[PDB]
Design an enzyme around this catalytic site. Structure first.
Site, PDB file in Angstrom:
ATOM      1  CD  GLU A 273      -2.723  -1.175  -0.212  1.00 60.83           C
ATOM      2  OE1 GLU A 273      -3.073  -2.336  -0.564  1.00 60.83           O
ATOM      3  OE2 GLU A 273      -3.110  -0.159  -0.588  1.00 60.83           O
TER       4      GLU A 273
ATOM      5  CG  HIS B  29      -1.524  -3.761  -8.385  1.00 56.13           C
ATOM      6  ND1 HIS B  29      -2.754  -3.806  -8.483  1.00 56.13           N
ATOM      7  CD2 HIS B  29      -1.188  -3.687  -7.263  1.00 56.13           C
ATOM      8  CE1 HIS B  29      -3.356  -3.765  -7.602  1.00 56.13           C
ATOM      9  NE2 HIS B  29      -2.436  -3.497  -6.554  1.00 56.13           N
TER      10      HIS B  29
HETATM   11  O1  LIG Z   1      -3.864  -5.574  -2.326  1.00 56.53           O
HETATM   12  C1  LIG Z   1      -4.052  -5.789  -1.395  1.00 56.53           C
HETATM   13  C2  LIG Z   1      -3.142  -5.614  -0.240  1.00 56.53           C
HETATM   14  C3  LIG Z   1      -2.182  -7.046  -0.376  1.00 56.53           C
HETATM   15  C4  LIG Z   1      -1.235  -6.816  -1.348  1.00 56.53           C
HETATM   16  C5  LIG Z   1      -0.194  -7.925  -1.783  1.00 56.53           C
HETATM   17  C6  LIG Z   1       1.500  -7.869  -1.381  1.00 56.53           C
HETATM   18  C7  LIG Z   1       1.075  -7.502   0.228  1.00 56.53           C
HETATM   19  C8  LIG Z   1       0.602  -8.549   0.882  1.00 56.53           C
HETATM   20  S1  LIG Z   1       1.729 -10.038   0.290  1.00 56.53           S
HETATM   21  S2  LIG Z   1       2.483  -9.317  -1.292  1.00 56.53           S
HETATM   22  N1  LIG Z   1      -5.570  -6.231  -1.112  1.00 56.53           N
HETATM   23  C9  LIG Z   1      -6.246  -6.465  -2.156  1.00 56.53           C
HETATM   24  C10 LIG Z   1      -5.606  -7.633  -2.785  1.00 56.53           C
HETATM   25  C11 LIG Z   1      -6.410  -8.874  -2.912  1.00 56.53           C
HETATM   26  O2  LIG Z   1      -6.583  -9.220  -4.059  1.00 56.53           O
HETATM   27 ZN   LIG Z   2      -2.569  -2.896  -4.806  1.00 54.89          ZN
END
Ligand SMILES: O=C(CCCC[C@H]1CCSS1)NCCCO
Ligand SMILES: [Zn+2]
Ligand SMILES: [Ca+2]
Ligand SMILES: [Ca+2]
Ligand SMILES: [Ca+2]
Ligand SMILES: [Zn+2]
Length: 156
Positions: A112, A121
């Site tokens: 974030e 992304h």
């Molecule tokens: O975008 C997010 C935040 C999670 C981002 C993923 C990165 C950080 C956590 S591990 S890698 N929520 C919506 C995504 C779910 O489809």
């Molecule tokens: Zn995102």
């Protein structure tokens, strides 16, 4: 992109899922990830307008991006700009944690804050800017080369 090197953040409100000091630490460690590879410096402030307001909220919460309950969308953030620009919102209907139970705050926050800084992304599952949540050990964690190229294309 932010046009200045000193950026402030403010924690608007704290999830009850976690210890206060743990929320502070996760978020601080997450900004540090990005500090490490840019000229940016981040400072937490306690009153007043910050660049990046950190909010925990559920459902409709005053922006045009309602949350969807447990699962699905975990968090979202706005790119650089004034007012809501920069702000990062975490869905309170998730269960935030320090570890692999629930949804790791640190990792999510790194992703974030990437958005808060101007990143979009990645298509690379190795990148922290990949959208899909996957726990990885929060001491094993590294930005990918894709991530570093991205942020350095914006700030360094
Ligand atoms: O975008 C997010 C935040 C999670 C981002 C993923 C990165 C950080 C956590 S591990 S890698 N929520 C919506 C995504 C779910 O489809
Ligand atoms: Zn995102
Ligand atoms: Ca802001
Ligand atoms: Ca959700
Ligand atoms: Ca929660
Ligand atoms: Zn929001």
């Amino acid at each position: 992109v932010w046009r200045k090197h000193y950026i402030t953040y403010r924690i608007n409100n704290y999830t009850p899922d976690m210890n206060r000091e743990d929320v502070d630490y996760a978020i601080r460690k997450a900004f540090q990830v990005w500090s490490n590879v840019t000229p940016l410096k981040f400072s937490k402030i306690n009153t007043g307008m910050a660049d990046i307001l950190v909010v925990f909220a559920r459902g409709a919460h005053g922006d045009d991006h309602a949350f969807d309950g447990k699962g699905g969308i975990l968090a979202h953030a706005f790119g650089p700009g004034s007012g809501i620009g920069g702000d990062a919102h975490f869905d309170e209907d998730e269960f935030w944690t320090t570890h692999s139970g629930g949804t790791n705050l640190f990792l999510t926050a790194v992703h974030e804050i990437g958005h808060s800084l101007g990143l979009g992304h990645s298509s690379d599952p190795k990148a922290v800017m990949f959208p899909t949540y996957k726990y990885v050990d929060i001491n094993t964690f590294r930005l990918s080369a894709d991530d570093i190229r991205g942020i350095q294309s914006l700030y360094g």
